[PDB]
Design a protein around this ligand. Structure first.
Ligand SMILES: Cc1ccc(-c2cc(=O)c3c(O)cc(O)cc3o2)cc1
Ligand SMILES: Cc1ccc(-c2cc(=O)c3c(O)cc(O)cc3o2)cc1
Lengths: 809, 809
């Protein structure tokens, strides 16, 4: 129907239908009479997968022929979402498949909805990995995603009585048609044991073996016929394992638990053994695989053929592991092995928040990875010797920079390990990268300034525009062509259309259609009635104190109280939608969810309010829900305390999809405002500098409570039980935190937020000027493409040249 | 090459090759350069599976159209072995696939060897299920095998220092291409809880739910285009299960352990909770499925549409479960529900050995299945009331016949439950069925003589002749045609060829070729040197006291001692091969294995012996090894104490494949000797009557030790450490048992065994007369086809007529 979805040729369509009917019969062992919609999804999935195979084989063949430098993206998270539509998009099969299925009397949209999300990630960090894979394939890089095939991904979130409940994400129940098991590439991973010092170096012995079995998933580039690989490792017990008999067999589960479940913490460190096992498991299996590929091309050339990107410190053990292989197994001298390691590895930092910092107790590493600890101590000694030589007598520096933290229990700072063992350390937005150099890694910067880079995050415009927002994609394509999808900078051409009446009409029309479709989706799946003519005010992201959903809650209650004070005065109608998962053990995050729903219970049922104000908690926020709600959004809420949100990526998704941003000068917000112009952005609140000023003198929340009557009223309402009639003291922990222990200074930004929100409403009253500002945002969103990001990684870190040239089909 | 393997048409071969190359590419994502032999096996497996699909869909469709009476074979064991060759055989694709693969430069035989056995069984009972499925498909019955998809089947057996070691049978590691998951047919199974008595009857509440997910495997009939279903249930935890968070996810394993591992006990009851869970799980999921199919055709008609065969007492809970559904859920009156149950269910008994009898502690059923216990007590009360009325004043009868056994702990006799709740009780050989009526079920017979039947066991001639012994199949086909494969009685026509020089030559030639091939197989896979001109003396079956491998050991040591006494005297050369698995906790069985190997260590390394005597323990005896060694055998050892082996089926396999039988008048041996003639059988030892005579007066083993010098020498050798120089007392437990606690009277049969073995050797010296006797055996083996067995089940128990008519392709 629409052009950017590709051609529906008579040949293609005939062929797709034939193969659909083939798979239904032979693959699914079903006829048309007994088939469920799930069968139909599977038939289509297999049919589309068939188009990947040739390209997948050719691409891997090609990388063998040409032997390019290989990029290894190590992450414990790949937040992939659904694969079907994305595959169709990148292969240009969407319209053909739409037509083929239509003729079979099926709605492709309905079939797409049957696919489970591969939710093998928590949030930003995980989704960045996913976007990166897409971009790396699109830019023709010989790149491999390496991670863990979790049996269970991020929990499914149910709301029960306004509270979050967690359900196991059994995503593999019905099978995964996208993966291919490679049992022939199974590799041993070792744990426990002890170190033995012989004549011929150190030997790790008496270990427990877990096997790592790889599953390969294709990563198609955008219309270039490149298909890269995501390899995820599954834990399998050896056959001699525990080998009364029955219990031995049952106890194989112990070993296989390693790949069982994704830890559901966002920007939080939990020092659990099972977590460390996951970290070693992925690192050990990957490095063996890397080295095997390399040897089928001495170690001098390793860094010319291998780049390893560490996604946060989660795979930091790659550094000691690479040393261990090089020193203990390959018998290189320390210094040479170290050179190779440093020149191979690069570290991306994702946050400065201290509770996220991985600091592993020594006693844990001692038991689990005895050899790796020795190697870490050796790295620490040699590193600290360089520091001593550069800064003679600066004993405090030595203490601050040590990989080993002294204290109650000794810990390893994995971030320090990463900086020491990497040739490049990058942040994920300009302000974040600057903060790293100014604050938490100041000492490291002073020693090795050359290591520290910026690589501002991005999002794939494939998933995050073409896929989720085809109507916007099309109207843009009608003006400026299709080239922009793989070259997002071309969106600037839209600036010359800012005074075009037809384009203004189109932008606004697409937004209205998206809103209608989302409001419909709500009624179908979660029976709730929302006004589509209202401003869609959405905050979707993990629930955190630092992300300040609470600040949003305060505004929501403010609007409510203002309506009640003056019922018969006009206000711009809003639907306020907040969505996100709390980590299961994060009490405050779980309380915030409850507050959100508790406000809804009051606001949504007040006759005086009408449909002027609605508060909706979006249940089970995940990738596939982001694809629905983001296109439908008017106002993007990016309201973290300045200095807390390293980058964000949600911010970029909304900008690309025609929502305006209300936000702080935090993370990539700063660069978005820079690109679009401050006049086209609803910037409010303290800057980083302001927060520092407040910290130096001390943050007294009472002062704000005393001086802002509107704020006082809200706190009195929370305390007295206005929002919890049956349990008047329900929200005492919220009030107490805001008043006495608020690290994120919610009250400090309250006044500027509310005022700035008034300005949003004022602009919304003028549809034409709203839409013109929207155009200025979309048209300057080009920088925030992961294509740009990966291009910068490739040139400035990995030392490879990206390519837009197509492989032969 | 050979005719019974079907046509290799130019069209067929071209088509198979095209589809092989298709699957390699699309299914396995491999090209010819990277493919392993395992890939090639998989490509062929998928290609052959493609030929099943059409027939599978049509057959199930047909059963919906015609709505025939449905047979449900409930077993906890299906010893299927490999599927590929069997599928090819039954579809007539063998030669075409041989040709197709040959042209692709591959050896099909090598690819076949890559397939894992589906070892979801222990021995006789399990293999009988498998043969039955084949026969039921071949005889056009609307039949379904129902069982458990164990993640791990019967352990793989390694010999280490002459001792059995067990390894996990991880048969699903590389995937199973034969199964199809049916998640849409997932069903809840309940455990624990408590009973609540309301106004409207009893209610089972507060239960723990496990889900049962079915996997369907095709069962092709022989060349009739019928494909029946084996449905095996897998345990899956519900998503709300245990739903800190991490542990909850990990604890899903608890629930899934139900389908994890097959209990590796042969004819032995182990009263473990996990075992009872397996028994309820398969019964609960199956009965729901049966009832669902039935309702898509009141309960009056259930037995006209449903037969349920219980394979031993393992699925005895089907009786209380059917009552529970009918009474508690469907709200039928007790008496009517009972009528339906009895008319639906039939019980096959597999042994009289008391340690095999399932006697479940009440406290276990009380906790796990509270409602089923109440129903059992109710059955018991009503049953005992009928007994009281028939035998007034016979209080002892009441005690003997009770479903509930009084004692230290109360137990339920599941065999009593089965007799009470079934319209038919059958043994598995004439002598066994008679023993049931005379001894262990005398009381039950006296009450309901009409219930007790015989159904002598059989083996499928497809697997056990055509598949494993194509050369024998062919030479038979050259004379009498191919019809015999589905009508084994036609083998009688071979009696008219007993004096044909050409046929005698052919029978002997095939035997020699089989021996050469097996002797080769030994060298390749287990580097050992055997004389192919020797008599192949084989005993393969589970290791048991009752099966008397020990008696065989005594003979072996006797031959050895005789050679040593007179080195320069001629003896017929023998290779003695004993194979079988011991249950992991069966100490005596594990000692016997050790003795066997210990004899080998002495005999096989004695220079004086030469190649006149070799003792080989066949490692990892399983279905696929039976297919190799049985065709190669000359003498079949069936030497159980009379009254112990209910039937046996190994006996029949050897008879079909041109080995002579040395054996006791036990089990089906009696009928084999009857069919072939006693003069064509090496019958020795006590009859049942003789054993009874010995028991009445008492078995004193000392008497035999005192009177038989040859026997005394052997016992002195065992005791003094002739066979265990380093550990002189290794075999004290063997000696002590034989002397003082031998339930199986090894010494009593010793003299007649050795003498009868002398007669075997004498006949072997005359090849022509040996072969003529072989022909008389093969030619009278027709009765022992499972086709005959199933035909008798169908007519005399199930009330359905078998059919040899083909379905349209
Ligand atoms: C700034 C900031 C960041 C993260 C957190 C956080 C995140 C968690 O997931 C979390 C948890 O699972 C258990 C717990 O006891 C505390 C926790 O705290 C708090 C504050
Ligand atoms: C006649 C007869 C039959 C079966 C057995 C038998 C079989 C077993 O599997 C077994 C076992 O696993 C553990 C054990 O302690 C004893 C056992 O005894 C013994 C004698």
């Amino acid at each position: 129907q629409i052009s950017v979805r590709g051609l529906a040729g008579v040949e293609n369509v005939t062929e797709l239908k034939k193969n659909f009917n083939r798979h239904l019969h032979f693959t699914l062992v079903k006829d048309r009479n007994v088939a469920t919609p799930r069968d139909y999804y599977f038939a289509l999935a297999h049919t589309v997968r068939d188009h990947l195979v040739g390209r997948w084989i050719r691409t891997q063949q090609h990388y063998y022929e040409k032997d390019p430098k290989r990029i290894y993206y190590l992450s414990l998270e790949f937040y992939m979402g659904r694969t079907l539509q994305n595959t169709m998009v990148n292969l240009a099969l969407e319209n053909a498949c739409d037509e083929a299925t239509y003729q079979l009397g099926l709605d492709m949209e309905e079939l797409e909805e049957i696919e489970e999300d591969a939710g093998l990630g928590n949030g930003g960090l995980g989704r960045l990995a996913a976007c990166f894979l897409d971009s790396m394939a699109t830019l023709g890089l010989a790149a491999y995603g390496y991670g863990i095939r979790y049996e269970f991904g991020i929990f499914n979130q149910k709301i029960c009585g306004g509270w979050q409940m967690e359900e196991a994400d059994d995503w593999l129940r019905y099978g995964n048609p996208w993966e291919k098991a490679r049992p022939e590439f199974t590799l041993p991973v070792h744990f426990y044991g002890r170190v033995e010092h012989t004549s011929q170096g150190a030997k790790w012995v008496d270990t427990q073996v877990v096997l790592a079995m790889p599953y390969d998933t294709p990563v198609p580039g955008y219309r270039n016929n490149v298909v890269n690989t995501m390899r995820l490792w599954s834990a399998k017990a050896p056959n001699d394992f525990n080998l009364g008999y029955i219990q031995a067999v049952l106890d194989r589960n112990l070993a296989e638990n390693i790949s069982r479940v994704l830890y559901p913490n966002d920007n939080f460190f939990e020092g659990k053994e099972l977590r460390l096992k996951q970290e070693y498991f992925v690192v050990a299996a990957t490095l063996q695989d890397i080295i095997r590929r390399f040897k089928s091309s001495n170690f001098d050339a390793f860094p010319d053929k291998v780049a390893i990107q560490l996604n946060d410190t989660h795979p930091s053990l790659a550094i000691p592991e690479l040393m261990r292989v090089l020193v203990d197994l390959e018998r290189l001298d320390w210094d040479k092995a170290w050179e190779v390691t440093v020149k191979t590895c690069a570290y991306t930092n994702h946050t400065v928040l201290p509770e996220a910092l991985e600091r592993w107790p020594v006693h844990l590493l001692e038991t689990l990875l005895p050899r790796h600890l020795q190697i870490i101590y050796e790295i620490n000694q040699r590193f600290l010797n360089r520091v001593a030589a550069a800064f003679p007598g600066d004993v405090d520096r030595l203490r601050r920079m040590s990989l080993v933290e002294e204290g109650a229990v000794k810990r390893i700072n994995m971030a320090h390990l990463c900086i020491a063992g990497s040739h490049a350390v990058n942040g994920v937005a300009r302000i974040h990268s600057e903060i790293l150099k100014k604050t938490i890694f100041k000492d490291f910067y002073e020693l090795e300034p050359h290591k520290f880079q910026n690589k501002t995050n991005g999002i794939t415009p494939r998933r995050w525009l073409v896929l989720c927002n085809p109507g916007l994609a099309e109207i843009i394509a009608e003006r400026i062509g299709e080239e922009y999808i793989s070259d997002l900078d071309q969106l600037r051409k839209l600036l010359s259309y800012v005074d075009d009446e037809a384009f203004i009409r189109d932008v606004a029309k697409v937004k209205q259609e998206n809103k209608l479709k989302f409001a419909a989706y709500l009624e179908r799946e979660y029976k709730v009635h929302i006004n589509p003519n209202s401003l869609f005010d959405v905050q979707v992201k993990r629930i955190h104190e630092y992300k300040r959903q609470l600040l949003n809650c305060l505004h929501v209650i403010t609007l409510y109280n203002r309506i009640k004070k003056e019922p018969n005065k006009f206000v711009v109608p809003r639907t306020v939608m907040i969505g996100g998962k709390a980590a299961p053990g994060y009490h405050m995050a779980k309380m915030i969810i409850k507050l959100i729903t508790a406000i809804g219970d009051v606001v949504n049922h007040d006759p005086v309010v009408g449909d002027r104000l609605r508060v909706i908690f979006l249940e089970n926020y995940r990738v596939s829900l982001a694809e629905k709600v983001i296109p439908a959004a008017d106002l993007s809420e990016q309201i973290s305390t300045a200095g807390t949100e390293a980058s964000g990526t949600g911010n970029m998704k909304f900008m690309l999809n025609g929502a305006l941003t209300i936000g702080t000068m935090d993370g990539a917000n700063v660069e978005m405002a820079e690109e679009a112009g401050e006049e086209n952005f609803f910037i409010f609140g303290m800057r980083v500098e302001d927060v520092d000023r407040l910290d130096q003198r001390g943050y007294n929340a009472q002062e704000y409570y005393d001086r802002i009557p509107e704020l006082r009223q809200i706190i009195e309402q929370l305390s007295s039980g206005f929002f919890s009639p049956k349990q008047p003291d329900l929200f005492k922990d919220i009030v107490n935190m805001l008043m006495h222990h608020d690290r994120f200074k919610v009250f400090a930004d309250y006044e500027e937020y509310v005022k700035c929100q008034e300005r949003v409403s004022a602009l919304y009253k003028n549809p034409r000027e709203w839409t013109r500002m929207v155009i200025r945002n979309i048209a300057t969103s080009g920088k925030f493409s992961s294509d740009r990001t990966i291009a910068q990684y490739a040139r400035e870190i990995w030392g490879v040249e990206p390519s837009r040239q197509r492989l032969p089909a």
